[PDB]
Design an enzyme around this catalytic site. Structure first.
Site, PDB file in Angstrom:
ATOM      1  N   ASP A 394       0.841  -1.145   0.182  1.00  0.00           N
ATOM      2  CA  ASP A 394       0.086  -0.054   0.083  1.00  0.00           C
ATOM      3  C   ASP A 394       0.869   1.382   0.006  1.00  0.00           C
ATOM      4  O   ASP A 394       1.998   1.170   0.411  1.00  0.00           O
ATOM      5  CB  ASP A 394      -0.903   0.043   1.082  1.00  0.00           C
ATOM      6  CG  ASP A 394      -1.917   1.174   1.145  1.00  0.00           C
ATOM      7  OD1 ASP A 394      -2.099   1.875   2.268  1.00  0.00           O
ATOM      8  OD2 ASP A 394      -2.324   1.451   0.179  1.00  0.00           O
ATOM      9  N   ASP A 486      -8.168   5.158  -2.415  1.00  0.00           N
ATOM     10  CA  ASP A 486      -9.306   6.052  -1.393  1.00  0.00           C
ATOM     11  C   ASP A 486     -10.326   6.494  -1.967  1.00  0.00           C
ATOM     12  O   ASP A 486     -10.310   7.677  -2.791  1.00  0.00           O
ATOM     13  CB  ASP A 486      -8.337   6.678  -0.493  1.00  0.00           C
ATOM     14  CG  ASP A 486      -7.314   6.156   0.565  1.00  0.00           C
ATOM     15  OD1 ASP A 486      -7.588   4.614   0.310  1.00  0.00           O
ATOM     16  OD2 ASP A 486      -6.542   6.632   1.030  1.00  0.00           O
TER      17      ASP A 486
END
Ligand SMILES: *[C@@H]1O[C@H](CO)[C@@H](O[C@@H]2O[C@H](CO)[C@@H](O[C@@H]3O[C@H](CO[C@H]4O[C@H](CO[C@H]5O[C@H](CO)[C@@H](O)[C@H](O)[C@@H]5O[C@H]5O[C@H](CO)[C@@H](O)[C@H](O)[C@@H]5O)[C@@H](O)[C@H](O[C@H]5O[C@H](CO)[C@@H](O)[C@H](O)[C@@H]5O)[C@@H]4O)[C@@H](O)[C@H](O[C@H]4O[C@H](CO)[C@@H](O)[C@H](O)[C@@H]4O[C@H]4O[C@H](CO)[C@@H](O)[C@H](O)[C@@H]4O[C@H]4O[C@H](CO)[C@@H](O)[C@H](O)[C@@H]4O)[C@@H]3O)[C@H](O)[C@H]2NC(C)=O)[C@H](O)[C@H]1NC(C)=O
Ligand SMILES: *[C@@H]1O[C@H](CO)[C@@H](O[C@@H]2O[C@H](CO)[C@@H](O[C@@H]3O[C@H](CO[C@H]4O[C@H](CO[C@H]5O[C@H](CO)[C@@H](O)[C@H](O)[C@@H]5O[C@H]5O[C@H](CO)[C@@H](O)[C@H](O)[C@@H]5O)[C@@H](O)[C@H](O[C@H]5O[C@H](CO)[C@@H](O)[C@H](O)[C@@H]5O)[C@@H]4O)[C@@H](O)[C@H](O[C@H]4O[C@H](CO)[C@@H](O)[C@H](O)[C@@H]4O[C@H]4O[C@H](CO)[C@@H](O)[C@H](O)[C@@H]4O[C@H]4O[C@H](CO)[C@@H](O)[C@H](O)[C@@H]4O)[C@@H]3O)[C@H](O)[C@H]2NC(C)=O)[C@H](O)[C@H]1NC(C)=O
Ligand SMILES: *[C@@H]1O[C@H](CO)[C@@H](O[C@@H]2O[C@H](CO)[C@@H](O[C@@H]3O[C@H](CO[C@H]4O[C@H](CO[C@H]5O[C@H](CO)[C@@H](O)[C@H](O)[C@@H]5O)[C@@H](O)[C@H](O[C@H]5O[C@H](CO)[C@@H](O)[C@H](O)[C@@H]5O)[C@@H]4O)[C@@H](O)[C@H](O[C@H]4O[C@H](CO)[C@@H](O)[C@H](O)[C@@H]4O[C@H]4O[C@H](CO)[C@@H](O)[C@H](O)[C@@H]4O[C@H]4O[C@H](CO)[C@@H](O)[C@H](O)[C@@H]4O)[C@@H]3O)[C@H](O)[C@H]2NC(C)=O)[C@H](O)[C@H]1NC(C)=O
Ligand SMILES: *[C@@H]1O[C@H](CO)[C@@H](O[C@@H]2O[C@H](CO)[C@@H](O[C@@H]3O[C@H](CO[C@H]4O[C@H](CO[C@H]5O[C@H](CO)[C@@H](O)[C@H](O)[C@@H]5O)[C@@H](O)[C@H](O[C@H]5O[C@H](CO)[C@@H](O)[C@H](O)[C@@H]5O)[C@@H]4O)[C@@H](O)[C@H](O[C@H]4O[C@H](CO)[C@@H](O)[C@H](O)[C@@H]4O[C@H]4O[C@H](CO)[C@@H](O)[C@H](O)[C@@H]4O)[C@@H]3O)[C@H](O)[C@H]2NC(C)=O)[C@H](O)[C@H]1NC(C)=O
Ligand SMILES: OC[C@H]1O[C@@H](O[C@H]2[C@@H](OC[C@H]3O[C@@H](O[C@H]4[C@H](O)[C@@H](O)[C@H](O)O[C@@H]4CO)[C@H](O)[C@@H](O)[C@@H]3O[C@@H]3O[C@H](CO)[C@@H](O)[C@H](O)[C@H]3O)OC[C@@H](O)[C@@H]2O)[C@H](O)[C@@H](O)[C@H]1O
Ligand SMILES: OC[C@H]1O[C@@H](O[C@H]2[C@@H](OC[C@H]3O[C@@H](O[C@H]4[C@H](O)[C@@H](O)[C@H](O)O[C@@H]4CO)[C@H](O)[C@@H](O)[C@@H]3O[C@@H]3O[C@H](CO)[C@@H](O)[C@H](O)[C@H]3O)OC[C@@H](O)[C@@H]2O)[C@H](O)[C@@H](O)[C@H]1O
Ligand SMILES: *[C@@H]1O[C@H](CO)[C@@H](O)[C@H](O)[C@H]1NC(C)=O
Ligand SMILES: *[C@@H]1O[C@H](CO)[C@@H](O)[C@H](O)[C@H]1NC(C)=O
Ligand SMILES: *[C@@H]1O[C@H](CO)[C@@H](O)[C@H](O)[C@H]1NC(C)=O
Ligand SMILES: *[C@@H]1O[C@H](CO)[C@@H](O)[C@H](O)[C@H]1NC(C)=O
Ligand SMILES: *[C@@H]1O[C@H](CO)[C@@H](O)[C@H](O)[C@H]1NC(C)=O
Ligand SMILES: *[C@@H]1O[C@H](CO)[C@@H](O)[C@H](O)[C@H]1NC(C)=O
Ligand SMILES: *[C@@H]1O[C@H](CO)[C@@H](O)[C@H](O)[C@H]1NC(C)=O
Lengths: 717, 240, 239
Positions: A394, A486
């Site tokens: 990530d 996101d």
């Protein structure tokens, strides 16, 4: 096959050299450089020779003909032909033009170098520094009717990228990749790791490189409407995906975040007691002691081998853990990483690249092979050899720490202050010259570790996967899936994610997914992300239903709630109200029921680059005449509908309080029949019309071609 | 009966960058921004101060009425154009710019704001390529897919709608790129910069760049829709 | 032309690294008094603050500094001097205000940090920014000058990095020896390469302006207080 009669053409046009070579089926590779020849250590993302093509061995720098471009020439490979021409009314051979030979014998101009009488040089070079590295701007002609598909992922709610400028700078949810298809019947790869710009203008297509020593691109032609071949050529150039492990095709449970070991063990106990199947449990970030330790904090994960075995014993599910590329001074590895030069650094000052968790940090150098091996030695010691064999890589966009603003983790006011994004030093170049490689090489770090532990070659069947938020050209070659990053938990966001995944398909990426229900709370929408309000409970059930018909079904997010009994608010299939639990579990069971269909379409993607989730132009542009315009206008029927495999047509419900949904059923090519069968009513409809079907909260609008028993069997190819 | 402004200008201190927004002429705002070093005062400008025709009695210069760090939102109105400083994302602040027009029917229409969705680069991007303090600038504004752009100078493109085109600001035979355009949303825009650069009239973002400068300067003027003769009346009052 | 120094500064100046709390300073003045040994100025070194950028003595170790300075002057008649660094960290109570009003220098790309110290990466305040000079004196006058400490030790203000010819100060000597390039930072008056030599000169100027403002005196006239600087430039003798 119309094999070529020349191994390549090398043009000496003043101080610039242009090397055009036949490359793969119906493709040409063009390389150009001023004054200094290529070092040979330039970063390339295409295969030489292509994975599949007419060649027996690699081309290299080999060529058959050398000229100064005084007279026009012609070169043909497959159905694409190159014609060197002059500029203006001149008769010469220093300008490039590409044609396709159609089936009816006629030819169609794909594109040429943008050089009308009054215009800048279509191969523009500029020297900004004292050295020999240069900036490049290459211009190609375009027509007003053209349509551009691909260019990576982006939250723009469009699949036709015409009229847009796409900056080649990575940040959260934005993976610009210069690989696109045109509806004229050709694909284009800007094989450059440098940051820059994509201009898809009305009359001119322009690619730029901030700093480079060599320009390199590939153009490949296909007959119009035949996008399956374009993807076959692109994947043969940039990588054929491996086959995914069967467990990864199930239900993937995740959230932000499961904080300690006993919380994870009770989660597996809950799935087991409720008889709800789960294939993978994911552990998010902040589970370490320091940034750069790359190991679970023993104070909250005392025995992780016991945790993974207990989770596997109750649910059979595998486990996945998160890692960030940032390292802080408080890390036990900071001294070792600093001494061996395994960290990137800003080119002046202390060298920190961003901030997080109240500390200023430095990203590890994924382009440095020693740094990649150092990082796997930590992951294999602390995770892989302890039952956690899948990895969540990530926040590795490159440069800064995953965002388009500096000073991450600080106040939004400070984040909004326009501190310049860092042009860092890597082992392979600078951020401006090689930056696009960083997330691609980060995936490669885990791929090399996977293939080393299992003693298997890249491209073969995967035993484990990785979850990445970024990538580049040919990222599909890794045991790695990309997700859209996101997103806000509102209705408009759910509609925008579809076009992002369809653009990823045109870029060559098949292993794509989202966060079921969104990730971030929208502060302007009071109910956003609240698992206890009926408003967001409705949104989540619509969203979770859609992820059933995506390459990977995964839930994740940072929820808010009125009642909390853990470190964070819950995101489990039983956390959205008693009435909604059977709806979510039904789609979980449906996902496993589609296992044969999933493994079959994932295998064709592995063999042909056969796109998994498919924009409507790939299957019905030849058929339905109405689709060409529905894509040009970016209608909701083309940006929010798609083919999941060869048989399923999906269209998510993107509005609240809805019981009927309008789905456009494309024409299939048999006008006297009714090929579309609605999943929930088994009623048949004719192609070429928009129908309003019953879409209650538990039903997602899905049609299918052929019989349902055959698509459930997998025998669809 | 002109809706005269109640403030001579607003000066925002947003970190190291200063943004000075002033009412300028009829239904117009002038925006200037610079990082770290204040304007020399010898920058080249192509607009009149005060405008050839407007509500003003004397030149504005650097004058302003209110100074803030942009922690809270503010609002300023001049004529039929309104400025609203806002935050970025779900935040409530006042360091982002947005421009509205007050229609005849009382409602308001968003002309454009600074292109700052949740995940995006800074709409006022600065970059230092040399050892000195001169910088390159990239300013981004929002756009809609249906918008139409008229003007931008001369070019042999056979188009009057410049939407979807990139216009390089480098002069050559028959090509005079000039960053003065009208939009069918009812506003005109002047990129008051002598530096070479780029005009991006993209589907969702309008972007202007400056290769090397010490100060960014632009003017936005609003007019009621369909009323292009007024837009040209305002542009000529600003530039000649 | 240099000013005339205050008469007390020509005496014996006691200092070391470092007097750590208030009671140690008070016992030091008691020792000079009991032994009848003259001393003209007592100096408090660095690391006496809570955070980098607070520009005030840590109250946990200096609870009543107006009483400390008065007790020192009662026993020995000596004046006092305190140390301050130009570095600002995120934990500082002034970090948000310094960041918002653009009173910090910054490297021209990346987060903007200019160096490190005390285990944290920091940013130097912009001595070339007149508003930043005012911000810093408002702290020094509030916490020192108005509390009996009217002489200031402006240490480690060479400019660019944090006082040394190597980056990553405070870390291991191996890391410090890694040739990280010295930063060409952004100032309000230019860059480090174009105006950098001004930084310590303008840092002296910050306290000179504060001294002359409190005493209602013109620069060049007789000084009431002094500052201790480790750097300077052309004409630094005017302070
Ligand atoms: C209303 O508004 C409308 C839009 O707003 C407006 O439309 C615009 O109209 C104009 C005028 O019609 C259009 O302009 C034309 O565009 C053509 C296409 O150009 C593109 O492709 C060519 C290459 O194309 C070839 O191959 C294709 C397909 O295979 C063929 O269809 C073509 O005919 C052509 O084929 C030849 O060459 C092949 C290979 O070399 C051969 O195999 C084949 O046998 C043929 O010989 C590209 O070269 C073009 O690139 C140029 O521009 C781009 C971008 O600007 C640059 O990047 C690049 O550097 C180039 O500059 C382009 O991409 C053009 O072909 C066409 O050109 C002819 O006329 C112009 C003058 O206008 C000449 O300068 C030019 O030399 C061409 O002339 C030859 O042919 C003409 C007639 O066809 C003859 O009269 C002339 O004598 C000349 O003869 C030559 O070839 C003859 C072939 O037989 C030969 O016999 C002769 O002996 C001689 O050798 C022209 O520019 C424009 O596109 C429209 N715009 C839009 C958006 O649609 C409309 O008009 C308006 N309506 C009204 C009423 O006003
Ligand atoms: C098929 O495909 C289609 C695409 O091809 C697709 O269309 C897309 O649909 C989506 C959703 O339908 C569209 O997204 C919306 O866009 C709106 C417009 O955005 C621009 O303008 C606003 C400013 O708008 C103000 O002024 C205008 C004109 O005067 C008014 O009309 C507006 O209402 C608004 O007015 C308010 O504020 C004014 C100033 O303060 C006041 O004067 C006034 O009184 C009002 O209070 C800009 O802010 C936007 O800028 C943002 O984005 C740009 C570019 O990305 C950035 O540069 C910039 O930095 C900003 O980020 C933009 O320029 C949006 O207004 C709208 O926003 C709402 O929903 C989103 C979630 O999606 C929220 O995050 C956001 O906060 C908004 O929420 C409020 O309102 C909603 C409902 O209206 C409430 O549900 C919610 O609770 C919230 O309430 C707030 O305000 C309420 C007002 O009273 C208040 O009561 C509440 O208390 C609360 O404060 C949204 O983003 C998109 O544009 C379409 N795209 C296209 C091309 O059409 C279509 O959906 C598809 N169809 C299907 C079935 O799939
Ligand atoms: C980056 O930089 C920052 C700063 O810029 C660095 O931070 C600093 O680091 C230094 C040292 O590295 C620290 O100095 C130490 O501070 C501690 C803490 O002192 C405070 O807190 C005490 C207790 O607090 C608790 O209880 C209170 C109750 O109110 C409660 O409120 C609070 O929540 C907490 O629970 C206070 O009692 C103490 O106050 C006392 O003294 C004050 C001085 O004048 C006075 O004002 C007060 O009235 C009060 O009397 C204070 O607030 C100190 O304890 C420590 O001092 C010890 O160690 C030093 C040597 O380092 C030594 O010289 C001292 O004598 C003292 O030693 C005693 O205990 C030792 C055991 O370790 C023992 O060995 C010694 O003998 C001695 O003890 C006994 O016998 C002797 C003589 O026989 C006798 O004198 C004693 O009374 C006792 O009986 C240091 O001063 C800084 O505080 C710290 N600053 C900050 C902001 O954190 C940081 O390290 C850097 N970071 C990095 C990465 O580099
Ligand atoms: C930047 O990022 C870093 C990390 O990347 C951030 O650091 C982290 O912050 C998180 C949360 O903010 C911390 O999680 C919290 O950790 C504490 C500490 O837990 C440990 O120590 C406990 C006490 O230890 C003592 O005794 C030992 C003896 O061995 C000594 O060695 C110690 O010195 C101490 O004296 C210990 O008891 C804990 O162990 C237990 O649990 C583990 C795992 O299940 C078991 O293995 C053990 O057997 C044992 O049972 C542990 O090792 C926790 O206490 C926190 O839990 C509470 O609060 C939670 C919400 O915050 C809540 O969900 C929990 O229920 C729990 O709640 C408590 O309070 C409730 C109501 O008040 C009560 O109902 C409840 O009973 C309980 O009392 C929490 O898990 C990380 O530890 C921390 N990581 C690091 C490295 O510091 C950092 O914050 C970030 N910083 C910035 C600026 O962003
Ligand atoms: O960034 C520090 C700053 O954040 C302020 O938050 C603002 C920010 O929120 C983004 C943040 O949302 C979390 O979730 C919260 C949510 O914000 C709340 O509204 C809701 O009630 O609770 C949930 C759960 O706690 C997410 O968990 C975070 O991941 C997310 O932050 C992003 O995190 C990524 C890395 O994970 C990072 O790279 C990004 O930079 C970061 O934005 O933005 C939206 C604003 O509305 C928020 O105010 C916060 O208030 C403040 O105190 C400070 O901590
Ligand atoms: O620099 C961090 C690094 O220091 C390692 O120390 C090496 C270093 O010492 C310089 C340091 O000396 C202090 O005095 C020490 C003395 O060095 C020791 O020999 C003695 O035994 O103890 C005294 C005091 O305890 C001074 O007080 C420091 O000022 C000085 O450091 C310099 O500090 C200034 C600011 O004060 C800063 O600007 C400089 O960048 C910094 O170098 O160099 C000499 C070597 O021989 C030492 O080994 C240390 O080992 C290591 O752990 C780490 O802390
Ligand atoms: C090769 O083929 C091209 C066209 O296919 C032709 O124009 C050219 O003359 C040929 N060259 C040689 C060496 O055969
Ligand atoms: C599997 O789970 C059961 C639960 O009772 C347990 O008895 C058994 O030992 C477990 N097996 C392993 C290897 O943990
Ligand atoms: C994988 O890497 C290891 C290093 O730990 C090496 O020993 C081994 O030979 C490699 N496996 C191969 C080449 O198959
Ligand atoms: C571990 O997780 C469980 C379940 O959420 C929670 O009850 C417990 O307090 C946690 N323990 C710690 C130390 O966080
Ligand atoms: C639709 O058909 C499927 C099998 O093709 C069946 O399982 C399902 O129950 C049917 N649904 C109906 C009749 O509503
Ligand atoms: C200082 O004050 C003390 C009382 O605290 C007193 O005894 C002494 O005489 C004073 N000395 C001077 C010089 O004022
Ligand atoms: C010095 O500056 C203060 C403000 O800080 C101002 O009020 C005063 O007039 C100035 N002059 C004197 C002698 O204090």
């Amino acid at each position: 096959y119309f094999a070529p009669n020349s191994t390549g053409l090398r043009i000496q046009h003043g101080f610039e050299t242009i090397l055009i070579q036949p490359f793969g089926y119906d493709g040409f590779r063009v390389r150009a450089w001023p004054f200094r020849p290529p070092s040979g250590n330039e970063i390339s993302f295409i295969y030489d020779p292509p994975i599949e093509g007419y060649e027996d061995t690699a081309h290299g720098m080999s060529y058959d003909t050398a000229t100064t471009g005084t007279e026009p020439r012609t070169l043909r490979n497959g159905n694409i032909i190159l014609r060197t021409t002059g500029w203006g009314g001149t008769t010469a051979g220093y300008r490039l033009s590409f044609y396709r030979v159609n089936d009816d014998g006629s030819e169609t101009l794909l594109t040429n170098e943008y050089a009308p009488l009054k215009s800048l040089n279509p191969r523009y070079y500029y020297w900004p520094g004292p050295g020999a590295e240069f900036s490049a701007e290459f211009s190609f002609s375009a027509t007003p009717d053209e349509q551009i598909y691909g260019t990576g992922t982006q939250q723009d709610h469009m699949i036709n990228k015409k009229g847009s400028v796409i900056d080649m700078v990575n940040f959260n949810s934005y993976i610009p990749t210069p690989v696109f298809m045109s509806n004229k019947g050709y694909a284009f790869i800007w094989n450059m790791p440098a940051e820059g710009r994509m201009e898809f203008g009305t009359l001119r297509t322009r690619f730029t490189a901030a700093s480079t020593t060599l320009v390199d691109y590939v153009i490949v032609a296909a007959q119009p409407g035949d996008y399956d071949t374009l993807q076959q050529r692109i994947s043969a150039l940039t990588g054929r995906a491996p086959a995914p492990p069967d467990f990864s095709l199930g239900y993937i449970q995740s959230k932000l975040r499961y904080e300690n070991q006993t919380e994870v063990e009770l989660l597996a106990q809950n799935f087991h007691d409720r008889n709800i199947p789960v294939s993978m449990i994911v552990i998010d970030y902040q589970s370490w002691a320091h940034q750069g330790d790359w190991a679970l904090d023993p104070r909250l994960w005392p025995n992780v081998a016991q945790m993974s075995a207990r989770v596997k014993n109750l649910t059979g599910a595998e486990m996945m853990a998160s890692l960030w590329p940032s390292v802080a001074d408080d890390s036990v590895n900071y001294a070792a990483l600093q001494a061996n030069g395994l960290l990137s650094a800003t080119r002046d000052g202390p060298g920190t690249t961003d901030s997080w968790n109240g500390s200023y940090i430095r990203n590890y150098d994924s382009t440095n092979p020693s740094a990649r091996k150092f990082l796997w030695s930590m992951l294999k010691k602390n995770y892989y050899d302890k039952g956690i064999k899948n990895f969540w890589i990530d926040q590795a966009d490159g440069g800064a720490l995953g965002e388009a603003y500096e000073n991450n983790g600080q106040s939004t006011y400070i984040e909004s202050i326009p501190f310049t994004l860092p042009n860092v030093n890597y082992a392979a170049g600078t951020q401006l010259s090689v930056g696009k490689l960083y997330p691609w090489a980060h995936q490669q770090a885990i791929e090399e570790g996977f293939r080393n532990a299992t003693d298997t070659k890249e491209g073969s069947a995967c035993d484990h996967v990785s979850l990445s938020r970024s990538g580049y050209i040919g990222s599909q070659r890794f045991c790695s899936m990309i997700w859209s990053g996101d997103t806000t938990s509102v209705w408009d966001t759910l509609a925008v994610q579809v076009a992002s995944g369809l653009s990823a398909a045109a870029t060559g990426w098949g292993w794509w997914t989202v966060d079921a229900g969104g990730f971030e709370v929208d502060s302007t929408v009071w109910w956003s992300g609240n698992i206890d309000t009926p408003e967001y409970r409705e949104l989540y059930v619509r969203w979770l239903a859609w992820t059933t018909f995506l390459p990977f079904m995964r839930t994740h997010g940072s929820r808010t709630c009125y009642f909390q009994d853990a470190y964070t608010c819950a995101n489990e299939p039983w956390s959205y109200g008693a009435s909604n639990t059977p709806i979510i579990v039904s789609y979980i069971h449906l996902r496993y029921q589609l296992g044969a269909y999933l493994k079959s379409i994932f295998n064709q993607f592995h063999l042909t680059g056969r796109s998994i989730m498919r924009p409507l132009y790939m299957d019905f542009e030849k058929t339905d005449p109405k689709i060409s315009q529905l894509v040009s206008s970016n209608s909701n029927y083309t940006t929010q509908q798609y083919m999941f495999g060869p048989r399923l047509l999906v269209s998510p419900v993107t509005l609240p309080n809805v019981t009927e949904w309008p789905v456009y059923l494309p024409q299939t090519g048999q006008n006297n029949t009714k090929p579309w069968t609605y999943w929930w009513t088994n009623e048949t409809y004719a192609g070429g019309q928009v129908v309003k079907v019953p879409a209650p909260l538990q039903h997602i609008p899905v049609f299918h071609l052929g019989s349902r028993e055959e698509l459930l069997s997998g025998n669809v190819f | 009966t002109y809706f005269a402004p109640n403030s001579t200008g607003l000066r925002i201190q947003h970190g190291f960058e200063t943004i000075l927004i002033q009412p300028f002429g009829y239904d117009g705002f002038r925006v200037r921004a610079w990082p770290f070093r204040p304007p020399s005062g010898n920058e080249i400008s192509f607009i009149y101060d005060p405008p050839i025709e407007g509500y003003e009695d004397t030149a504005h210069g650097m004058s302003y009425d209110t100074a803030t760090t942009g922690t809270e939102p503010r609002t300023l109105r001049n004529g039929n154009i309104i400025l609203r400083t806002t935050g970025w994302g779900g935040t409530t602040a006042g360091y982002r710019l947005s421009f509205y027009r007050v229609n005849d029917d009382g409602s308001e229409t968003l002309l454009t704001n600074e292109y700052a969705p949740l995940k995006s680069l800074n709409p006022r991007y600065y970059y230092w390529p040399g050892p000195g303090a001169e910088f390159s600038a990239e300013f981004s504004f929002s756009a809609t897919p249906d918008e139409q752009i008229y003007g931008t100078g001369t070019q042999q493109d056979h188009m009057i709608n410049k939407k979807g085109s990139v216009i390089d600001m480098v002069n050559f035979n028959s090509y005079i790129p000039t960053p003065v355009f009208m939009s069918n949303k009812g506003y005109a825009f002047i990129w008051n910069m002598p530096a070479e650069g780029r005009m991006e009239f993209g589907t969702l973002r309008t972007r202007f760049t400056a290769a090397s400068t010490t100060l960014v300067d632009y003017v936005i003027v609003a007019a009621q829709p369909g009323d292009y003769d007024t837009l040209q009346q305002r542009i000529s009052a600003l530039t000649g």
